[PDB]
Write a protein that binds this ligand. Sequence first.
Ligand SMILES: [Mg+2]
Ligand SMILES: [Mg+2]
Ligand SMILES: [Mg+2]
Ligand SMILES: [Mg+2]
Ligand SMILES: [Mg+2]
Ligand SMILES: [Mg+2]
Ligand SMILES: [Mg+2]
Ligand SMILES: [Mg+2]
Ligand SMILES: [Mg+2]
Ligand SMILES: [Mg+2]
Ligand SMILES: [Mg+2]
Ligand SMILES: [Mg+2]
Ligand SMILES: [Mg+2]
Ligand SMILES: [Mg+2]
Ligand SMILES: [Mg+2]
Ligand SMILES: [Mg+2]
Ligand SMILES: [Mg+2]
Ligand SMILES: [Mg+2]
Ligand SMILES: [Mg+2]
Ligand SMILES: [Mg+2]
Ligand SMILES: [Mg+2]
Lengths: 100, 127, 151, 83, 99, 208, 116
Amino acid sequence: AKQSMKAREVKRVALADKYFAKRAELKAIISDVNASDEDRWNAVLKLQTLPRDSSPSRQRNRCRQTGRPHGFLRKFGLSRIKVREAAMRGEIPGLKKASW
Amino acid sequence: NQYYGTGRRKSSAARVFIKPGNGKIVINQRSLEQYFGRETARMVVRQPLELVDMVEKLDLYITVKGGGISGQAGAIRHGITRALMEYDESLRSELRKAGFVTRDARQVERKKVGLRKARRRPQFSKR
Amino acid sequence: PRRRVIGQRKILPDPKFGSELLAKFVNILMVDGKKSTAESIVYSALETLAQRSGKSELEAFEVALENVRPTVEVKSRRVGGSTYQVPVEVRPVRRNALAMRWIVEAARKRGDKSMALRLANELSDAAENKGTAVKKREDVHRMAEANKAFA
Amino acid sequence: PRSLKKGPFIDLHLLKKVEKAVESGDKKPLRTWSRRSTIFPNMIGLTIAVHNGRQHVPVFVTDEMVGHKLGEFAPTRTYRGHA
Amino acid sequence: RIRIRLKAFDHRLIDQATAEIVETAKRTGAQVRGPIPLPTRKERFTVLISPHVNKDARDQYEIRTHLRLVDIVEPTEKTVDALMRLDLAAGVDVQISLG
Amino acid sequence: GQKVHPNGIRLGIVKPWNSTWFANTKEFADNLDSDFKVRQYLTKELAKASVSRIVIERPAKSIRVTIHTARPGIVIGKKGEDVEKLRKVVADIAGVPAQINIAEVRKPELDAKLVADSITSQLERRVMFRRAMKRAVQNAMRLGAKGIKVEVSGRLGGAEIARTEWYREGRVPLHTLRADIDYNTSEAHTTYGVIGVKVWIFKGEILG
Amino acid sequence: ARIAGINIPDHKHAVIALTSIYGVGKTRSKAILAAAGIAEDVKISELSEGQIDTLRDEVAKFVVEGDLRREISMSIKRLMDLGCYRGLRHRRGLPVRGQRTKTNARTRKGPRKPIK
RNA sequence: CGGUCCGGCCGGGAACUCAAAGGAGACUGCCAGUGAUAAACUGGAGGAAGGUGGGGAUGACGUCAAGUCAUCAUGGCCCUUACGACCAGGGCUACACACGUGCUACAAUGGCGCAUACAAAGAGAAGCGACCUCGCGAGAGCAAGCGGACCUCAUAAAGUGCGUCGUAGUCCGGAUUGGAGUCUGCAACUCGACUCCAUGAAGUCGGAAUCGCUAGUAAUCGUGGAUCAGAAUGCCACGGUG
Ligand SMILES: [Mg+2]
Ligand SMILES: [Mg+2]
Ligand SMILES: [Mg+2]
Ligand SMILES: [Mg+2]
Ligand SMILES: [Mg+2]
Ligand SMILES: [Mg+2]
Ligand SMILES: [Mg+2]
Ligand SMILES: [Mg+2]
Ligand SMILES: [Mg+2]
Ligand SMILES: [Mg+2]
Ligand SMILES: [Mg+2]
Ligand SMILES: [Mg+2]
Ligand SMILES: [Mg+2]
Ligand SMILES: [Mg+2]
Ligand SMILES: [Mg+2]
Ligand SMILES: [Mg+2]
Ligand SMILES: [Mg+2]
Ligand SMILES: [Mg+2]
Ligand SMILES: [Mg+2]
Ligand SMILES: [Mg+2]
Ligand SMILES: [Mg+2]
């Protein structure tokens, strides 16, 4: 993948770990039924004012070696290709071709 | 003096305990007529005890796990045959002929890649 | 197949009568693996068959089967510029399978409401030796004795 | 649609432009890229030029346009016909 | 008592470690319950082996995660610490549950 | 587009994994990135060193890297000089305390990665590929291999039409599962392109 | 057999002949018969005229044929007059709800129009 | 067994199921016949299994200058104040049409309503999320337990039993559309899924033509997972009937 797309992914991780407590504060406010509706309105306007890249749903799990946005696996952090290359070189423990 | 046999089927596993008696069938603390709402399964669980003449002769305590209606009935038949051969062993010459002592090894086939099922291939088109 | 003729698998008999043939009939009637329903349909149609005839359900089934069993079928050969429908003696197994198949197809095609009503009516007509199933038996024998010159 | 407990949605920069144009009472066209903002009753009588991807189409705001969003009045695909 | 859970990838290396720790607490302590085996997790995987386009061309991998449960009925003082100072091979993850 | 990887197919039978650790899913891909970065670093640093197999194992939050190499004198230097230099940066990368062990490679002519990299180095310094393939086969069968197959591919002698060639001496049963097939692959970055090298070595059958 | 303007078949049951009413379905027909205390398995046959008057009152509680069709056409002409995307879809004859127009829009577009 | 709140529940017990680990077992091994005393074939005998037991993985030399420089890598060429980089919005979802692959159907071997029985295999910590309460409902609140043979996802459905419809474009079918909503997520207009009420298209088994399948198979019935905030009729797996 590109270098700029990798840089965008790192930036969206840094912001998602930075503002993580504050966004949950505001969502606790908005989801709280026992709250002032003007407070819930102020919270949702604050949440607009926060950057869009602070959301974890904005960032996409790329391959950790190549940045490939598709074919990802959460357990390995890799695409389906580099999984196969590592499993064939025996860099992945306990992983072998199955048959049942 | 209960006599035991384990029967297995597709994915079922019966635990059959034979006692001499009057012919009382208890499956998971339930009657056979209560448990299998199916006369074919009521037949196949009574098939060896009428191959031999032991319908009235023995009572039975059965537990069974896993599977379906025919699966549990098959493992029950195979447990009964295993236990009657434990009881007498002179009956193996007939129950082999009846095809009962043979464990039916017809497992389900796995789904394969590309194929929508075990063997059904998707629909083909040249053009 | 090319290499071998095979050895066929064993079928259970029905629980009611012990007949292998009736279970072959419920398998031919059965769709989608629902054997329990097809067993119920056969036992209801043979219930009304013995009601309409006073005989055994098994006996009147064999009578209706008897009046539709073919003896000679045909097959296409086509070694020349056109199709030869060559006759051939039918083995008693295929006689019985074609009979139960034709009966089921006609009972699907009848306009009665219950399937057991289409099948008991078709069996009672076959025992009277009329109906579409025997008309299929007739059209088969007619193409047989027409192409009888080929042997 | 959105839940009622979150209420409606509107961009803050839009809500400030609405509050300004309300107090000034001017109907100059407000160019806006907020196609996702629900129209409010205080927006009635305003020309708001909603973006469509390519330009800003002006929308005079009516009473009935309240419970909707601004993007509904800016179509993004031009289609005339094939023949 | 002490429940001990062993999770590993090699079943020889886990049965070697479980019988090792049994013989350890059998000599030092007393009443090792048994090396009770648990069901093995089979974490399957299925990937496309082509870089661009072959949907039907796949590999199917798995990971078999072998479990062992070993209980110690009467913990002496040396039973605990001498087995805690005892170390095993890598690949085995141990997890003690005192009571 | 036809043949399976002989190591990956032999991994449960006669071949061991090059990474032997255990982790849950939380720290799995993180360990595997750390292993990738350290194998990357060690290959670039020990490029002149005849390194074959970097084995990684991490017990008790402490990484242990076992390097198999044909000559340990240039990797070590003095006893814990260059090794200790590489150890403190491995612990920097892995974020855990490190430990480096070195296994000497007897008979470096019987190791697939070394042979392929020697061929690659020769092709990079512009030798005849057939002479390199011959000397690799003669040396391995002399050293006692039961069978070797080498194969080069693409842009051979600067020829615009890429072809593959392969030599074979002895029996190389790939379908035999209990066969000790040492397989590895190198790449030569010539001025005319990329030349790929594959090498199979059959040592004999393990009778497990 | 004449409820809310329209006739109702007598041979059918209660919920079904009610569902002949434009504005009720099997749910609202159960709510009607529940509010009238009338069993659902009975017919429109063998009903008292007091029972039918109760039925007419319960249906009259809701919005039905002429009212409902007028309200629906009013909602559509509201979208028509606004000129929203749903209005443009309603007057181009295209599907509104965000379905596909490349293929399978045959309910709104009718049968196929051959290129001649 | 003994005891019970009748629930393996509770003392207990280790046989049984099961869970793994190791091992045995089937080899034409035996018997007869054929065969060129060969190879081998046919049969039966036992046996859980009989001749490759079943299924998978495993894909020779090479072919198509097949595919991919958009996984990656890379020779060379090109751009370098732009062919690079940042942001908002839009688009990849358009629509006179044509094709492929699928899903649901045209019903009575069925639809509905009530009652009720039997699965396997899996996933789970920024997660699975009981119980209880509110809501017709999707869901909401409080909130245990669980890194999990312990807890959760999670009641399997088809089935069976009773009643019902009684051959109709129907109590089939569910498209479409209106209104009211929930959840996710800064944010569901373009452009999400789901729920409720109403709406109730075509369709009554499909032209020439054509596809799959030889046994636990097809057919049919449900289940789970990956990806994923959310978003499958797809994909990969699982068992039921057969
Ligand atoms: Mg790049
Ligand atoms: Mg995402
Ligand atoms: Mg496909
Ligand atoms: Mg299936
Ligand atoms: Mg075509
Ligand atoms: Mg292959
Ligand atoms: Mg109605
Ligand atoms: Mg034999
Ligand atoms: Mg080409
Ligand atoms: Mg390109
Ligand atoms: Mg953008
Ligand atoms: Mg697309
Ligand atoms: Mg409630
Ligand atoms: Mg039912
Ligand atoms: Mg009913
Ligand atoms: Mg309906
Ligand atoms: Mg509806
Ligand atoms: Mg029509
Ligand atoms: Mg009809
Ligand atoms: Mg999931
Ligand atoms: Mg999802």
